[model samples]
Target: GTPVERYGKVQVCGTQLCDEHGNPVQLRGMSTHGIQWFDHCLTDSSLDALAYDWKADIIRLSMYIQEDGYETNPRGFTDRMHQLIDMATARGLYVIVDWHILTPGDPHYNLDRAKTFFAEIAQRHASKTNVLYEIANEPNGVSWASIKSYAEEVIPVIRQRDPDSVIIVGTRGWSSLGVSEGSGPAEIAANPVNASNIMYAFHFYAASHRDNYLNALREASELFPVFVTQFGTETYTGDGANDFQMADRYIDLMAERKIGWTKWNYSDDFRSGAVFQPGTCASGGPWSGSSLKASGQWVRSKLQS
Candidate 1:
């Protein structure tokens, strides 16, 4: 087996990313919640919507230990993941096989289990250009020190196998706000893992639930290359309506900063007003009604810039 060679960093527009030679890369994308639906793991309808309907540059597929049972036997999950990777690659989109585990859970609890899971995936797809590995979606309540320690543990294993593949790591609390307080960016950046092709991902629900959303984003940006990986609101006061104003504000900020982002989800049953979560109205069903879509025009404006 030939060792994987590093392709120089990928430069898109003005942003740079690491990609294996001959791999296509882009930052625009949407997050789908179908993977969270348990039984409907990899449905044709979900894949179609992700590829064709969303016209996304990147598509994030959630992979969990509890639901898919991948943590028990990673090979089972990797097999299916490879299939999806092939599918997304054929469609010319970047695929983020997200380890969508809730943090404080230590989804990859055992070192042997973690090693087996990462090594298998890295070895299998180390050379595949379109695939990116997100180690863990969100690790809430964990110290930056702990997060870095755990990442340091697994990242080198992945790097040794797949040097060219981009790896995404989340801050404390699923990359949530308030990381700067106890375990801030400086702390995160200090931890070394022997790999340069890495990015720090953070989630943004912001003040849609209250009001400090934008401020949190501004603060987080002061530290690292922040990716607003997840965000959307069903209502202003946690009710069940849409927070149009908050969504618009975030869109404008993204445009102004030229930051890359992916909304909370494309479609699913996670919650009402969550991208494509079900609702009473027919038009607002899967294909149509999405606060994400509602903010589509705003996103378009930003992308055009």
Candidate 2:
């Protein structure tokens, strides 16, 4: 079944995701960064536990050309990615295979390699209903026109093979704040190979908290479906400032608007004040365990709404 037929239009009502069937699906998920770096890739028991035990509906897996050593082979990262996908699908969860970065200019830098990679996967799993394809994670300092041009070049390759699969395209500037600053979907919709099953992806860091993320969301909503693909709080441990309250507010706004979102990560390493660590699951930070601290329970609560 094509994704559009099975899931319908990917619409947002506040923070929740509603399928064409009108069934509400919450975007509750965790990110597994460095899975390939640690060689834990698909075999990490910690990640498995996080997905099943936490009841995550989506899992964001990071992929980068530099990290993967510029190897253009899809099979290079296939082993781990396949494992994660199978596991997540068995648990009735959605998986986002993200092309982490096509930085240093356009995301189309590795167009040939990416096309080969996506083509293989789309053909293999065109029928798989649990997968979501994110063409690129973050493209910093780039313009919307450039991003849209690159997306136009690549979307057809996937659509040709997997007509129903949902393709996620990010705005320029690392998929950041400027999303609402441009012409919105005019450029994207202008040349989509499959417009009905597409969604716009964005990220929100500390700046989002201060910049009235909800207003931006409302503006973007008028254009097309909006997916808050990545968001997290940062605590300044003498090095930077923490934005837990911002994350809380973001969650509240998402729930109020029924928007779809996924938290930035599922581990404790990147941010000093994170919810889970190797051994601790009690949300060990200055903020109360019950608070939106590291455990991400507060995030889950908002999704339940």
Candidate 3:
């Protein structure tokens, strides 16, 4: 069965994601870099490859709030997001509506926009069983208390419209559980979001985040449910040499723990984190085979496995 047909509605079940039947499920897939920039890469052919060829169970719609993103044109970005959701839905894949909040450090900077955007998206996609809401992409330079507050405020907007869908909240220090800033998940573990049927987002760039991050994630997993909304084989900047050794370690841990993840990207961006080689989107050829970079090939193999 396709992901949605099989899983139906998903929920956090004590540090793990389970399908409607209460069976443990781990979703492995890719994420778009940014709808504003790499919208061209998500053409029918490529998305089809993601669904049928890549065999991805989910696709994250990374709608950035800044970097000339939703803030520039909220309605346009919102519509684009819904379109992507429909596309993913048609393919029988799960959609993570990522309210990609970067920059400005604090989520409160665009709290109103987050509320408005989620309200519309939740209301529109309420009936869909495959949709999951990622309230924030990565919350950096802020305390966990503040991040929790932001989530508590925004969650109700979506809950009012789509109550049962899983909500994934970003963690402190760019979703590294504060490990990048000399902290760990203890802060969040001690006090999770004030909502039910939710999970936390933990991001890692293999080359940049080493055993410390790995250990932190492992520790966090034991405490609360975690969904790796975005990760990369490269450094934290999303560009650099690949680190499959560390990446594999992380993968092994996730697989063993039943923690689902969507890799860094599936775009044709120049960065090494991008699965496709540069110009694959513009050329509009072969999303598989040699068209993929090393990282792309590696990620495809992981998904296929």
Q: Count the backbone clashes (under 3 Å) in each candidate.
A: 6, 20, 0
Clashing pairs in 1: 138-174, 139-174, 140-173, 206-213, 207-213, 234-241
Q: Candidates' lDDT values, in order?
A: 0.58, 0.61, 0.91
User: Looking at model 2, which ten-residue stretch has the lowest summed lDDT?
Assistant: 279-288
**Error at 192, model 3, angstroms:** 1.3
Task: Return the TM-score for each candidate structure.
Answer: 0.75, 0.78, 0.98
In model 3, the Cα lDDT at residue 301 comes to 97
- Residues 13-53 of candidate 3 have per-residue lDDT tens digits of 77789998888999999999998899999999999999999
Q: Score candidate 2 by TM-score against the native.
A: 0.78
Report the C-alpha lDDT of model 2 over 8-27, residue by residue, as the tens digit: 44443432457756676546
Over 4 Å off in model 2, which ranges?
1-17, 38-44, 69-74, 177-194, 235-241, 268-270, 273-275, 278-305
